[PDB]
């Protein structure tokens, strides 16, 4: 989630 994390897996 880019709404909560800086990068996506």
């Amino acid at each position: 989630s880019l709404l909560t994390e800086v990068e996506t897996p």
């Epitope: 989630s1 880019l2 709404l3 909560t4 994390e5 800086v6 990068e7 996506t8 897996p9």
Partner: antibody, heavy 115, light 113 residues
Framework: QVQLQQSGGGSVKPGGSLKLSCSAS????????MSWVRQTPEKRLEWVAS???????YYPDTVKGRFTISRDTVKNIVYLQMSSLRSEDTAMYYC?????????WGQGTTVTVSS | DVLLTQTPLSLPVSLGEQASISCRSS???????????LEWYLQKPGQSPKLLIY???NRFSGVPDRFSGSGSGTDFTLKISRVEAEDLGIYYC?????????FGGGTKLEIKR
């Protein structure tokens, strides 16, 4: 201490184009993922674009090829450039900072697509 | 797309009672064999949405523990244990495990008094 202010909303004709800004403070843009989420007049939330901290760009198909997210880390601003605007693009546009298990949304700027 | 079906649409509740909000996905979300990025947001009247819960069950900083996320398979729940007046507004679920990211349609929490 995080602020985000969106500006650049208003009225625009179907087919026209508009550039939104999100002006950020209390953090470095570059260290977070920045996104745009819109809320339609019927109160649906819809994800419209993301830019990771590393700069990868992500869009849904409903706006692909029309919307461009970008950032300027000197002015510390994130932008959404919209074109071939349609009626269904009418909405409140929020700018969202994401990272480290946190999300922070600005107050929104309203885009009305109308004649 | 991952479709999120959120129920109920309206949720009237008295002060101090419990509210349950459910979100049903069109598929198992788990990104790969890693995390499930299912989030809950609240929008209060006149404000923007704010994060309540991330990865199914973690509370965002400063959310009180009477807010509780769970779920598995295709069913996710947000439980609000002792509802106060300030909890009113529109709740949304959200998945960020697969592109395009999607939201549930929302649940309006109303306070009975």
């Amino acid at each position: 201490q995080v602020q985000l202010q969106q500006s650049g909303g208003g009225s625009v004709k179907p087919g026209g184009s508009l550039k939104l800004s999100c002006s950020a403070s209390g953090f470095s843009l570059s260290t977070y993922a920045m996104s745009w989420v819109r809320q339609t007049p019927e109160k649906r939330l819809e994800w419209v674009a993301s830019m990771s901290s590393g700069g990868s760009l992500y869009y849904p198909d409903t706006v692909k090829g029309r919307f461009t997210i970008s950032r300027d880390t000197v002015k510390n601003i994130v932008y959404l450039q919209m074109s071939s605007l349609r009626s269904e693009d009418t909405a409140m546009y929020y700018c969202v900072r994401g990272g480290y298990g946190t999300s922070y949304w600005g107050q929104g700027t309203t885009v009305t697509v109308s004649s | 797309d991952v479709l999120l079906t959120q129920t109920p649409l309206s949720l009237p509740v008295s002060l101090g009672e419990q509210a349950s909000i459910s979100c049903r996905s069109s598929q198992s979300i788990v990104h790969s064999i890693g995390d499930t990025y299912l989030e809950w947001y609240l929008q209060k009247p006149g404000q923007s949405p704010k994060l309540l819960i991330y990865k199914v069950s973690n509370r965002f900083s400063g959310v009180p523990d009477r807010f509780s996320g769970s779920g598995s398979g295709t069913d996710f729940t947000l439980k609000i244990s002792r509802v106060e007046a300030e909890d009113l507004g529109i709740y949304y679920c959200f998945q960020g495990s697969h592109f395009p990211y999607t939201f549930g349609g929302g649940t309006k929490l109303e306070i009975k008094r």
